[PDB]
Amino acid sequence: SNPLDICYDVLCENAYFQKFQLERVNLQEVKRSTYDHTRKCTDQLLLLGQTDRAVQLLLETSADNQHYYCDSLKACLVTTVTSSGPSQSTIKLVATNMIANGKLAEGVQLLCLIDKAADACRYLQTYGEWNRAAWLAKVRLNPEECADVLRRWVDHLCSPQVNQKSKALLV
Amino acid sequence: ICYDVLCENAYFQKFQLERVNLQEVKRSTYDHTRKCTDQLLLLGQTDRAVQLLLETSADNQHYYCDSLKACLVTTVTSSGPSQSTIKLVATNMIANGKLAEGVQLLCLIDKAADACRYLQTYGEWNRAAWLAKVRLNPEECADVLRRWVDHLCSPQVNQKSKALLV
């Protein structure tokens, strides 16, 4: 296939980048130690598309932790929200409200979880987190919707307060 | 209405609906709102409970859980093949100490009878009888009421008159 080397990151193909992200998240999942790492691994897996191995990992919280109810509810919701056709307006409204109130990571995660990554990328770019939005657009999304996000990122990179024309040229 | 458990099912349901409406009219604090939401979700009025769930202030510590619960109540209204894991999770929560939270979920999904026996197993006879009177067709409530009559006939309860009435 002759793919570009991974030393260029966002300049590579979608599948080649996705394979490396899968390998990295597998490495992260292998060496979890405490509760402050399992949550982050679950959050990463919930945006990398792995839905089957995240529910099982969620159903492991101890009966004494204060977040057991939240994790159980999240696992059940993820199990039962696998349908994207009907009953998606209220979920989108809740995600938008959570994003507006300040909780951005949860709203973006939920939006990418249900049916939509482009809107989550747009909200991420609106709040100034361009790197995570670009990474999200590279991982998920068809090569027809990521083009607009990358063009917007290039236009942002051409601002006089950034002066990163070389990266814009590469993208 | 003089006899609580000796009346018809529709009459009892209408009276508890009238009671919960009056309890919802005069909400004052957040704990009363939580109790009213619990009662409405246990009674089956999910449509008016979702709206009442999406009213938590953006400063309370329970906003996230209440926002996640409102979507869950809306999405799992159907009972398909993806319900076994939900029942397993509810059974684990009940066996882990929290009974009301799991009984509520079991009633919400499709299973009033399972919640009724779990309530009877843990000694909540009055609440289980109320649950059986409110929901369930007049074919499974009979077994639940006979199981309560058997308890009422024990030599430790000595409430044989109430058992005769039931």
Report the chain B residue with the minimal C-alpha distance to residue A89.
B71
**Are A167 and A157 contacting, i.e. CB atoms less than 8 angstroms apart?**
yes
Report the chain B residue with the minimal C-alpha distance to residue A78.
B72
Alpha-helical (H) ranges within B4-79 are: 9-25, 30-43, 46-53, 63-75
Interface probe with A: pick from B47, B67, B87, most Cβ of A within 10 Å: B67
**CA B116, chain centre distance (Å):** 9
How far is it, in rounded angstroms, from Cα A19 to Cα A119?
A: 24
Q: Which of A46, A114, A119, A104 is nearest to B75 (CA)?
A: A114
When CB atoms are compared, the residue of A55, A79, A94 closest to B67 is A94
Interface probe with B: pick from A76, A103, A114, most Cβ of B within 10 Å: A76
Does the distance separating the beta carbons of B64 and A70 come in below 8 Å? yes
How far is it, in rounded angstroms, from Cα B38 to Cα B31?
A: 10
How far is it, in rounded angstroms, from Cα B57 to Cα B55?
A: 6
Report the chain A residue with the minimal C-alpha distance to residue B53.
A94
Identify all chain A residues contacting B97, using CB atoms and an 8 Å cutoff: 63
DSSP labels for B11-30?
HHHHHHHHHHHHHHHT--SH
Secondary structure in 3-state letters for B97-154: CCCHHHHHHHHHHCCHHHHHHHHHHCCCHHHHHHHHHHCCCCCCHHHHHHHHHHHHCC
Give the number of beta-carbon pairs within 8 Å between A and B: 55
When CB atoms are compared, the residue of A59, A77, A103 closest to B72 is A77
Dihedrals φ, ψ of B2, to 5°? -60, -40
Q: Which of B22, B161, B124, B96 is nearest to A69 (CA)?
A: B96
- Please report where in the chains the tokens 């397993």 appear, as a residue: B88
Identify all chain A residues contacting B69, using CB atoms and an 8 Å cutoff: 73
Resolution of the structure, angstroms: 3.3
Identify all chain A residues contacting B101, using CB atoms and an 8 Å cutoff: 69
How far is it, in rounded angstroms, from Cα B156 to Cα B132?
A: 24
- Backbone torsion region of residue B53, taken as left when φ is above 0, otherwise alpha when ψ lies between -120 and 50, otherwise beta: alpha
Contacts of A117 (CB under 8 A, 6+ apart): A111, A136, A137, A140, A141
User: What is the maximum alpha-carbon separation in chain A?
Assistant: 54
3-state secondary structure of A107: helix
Q: Is A56 on the interface with B (CB under 8 A)?
A: no
Contacts of A129 (CB under 8 A, 6+ apart): A104
DSSP labels for A60-96?
T--TTSTTHHHHHHHHHHHHH----SSS-HHHHHHHH
- Please report where in the chains the tokens 């003089």 appear, as a residue: B2
Identify all chain A residues contacting B89, using CB atoms and an 8 Å cutoff: 59, 72, 75-76
Does the distance separating the beta carbons of B72 and A80 come in below 8 Å? yes
- Please report where in the chains the tokens 């044989």 appear, as a residue: B160
Structure tokens at A7: 């030393």
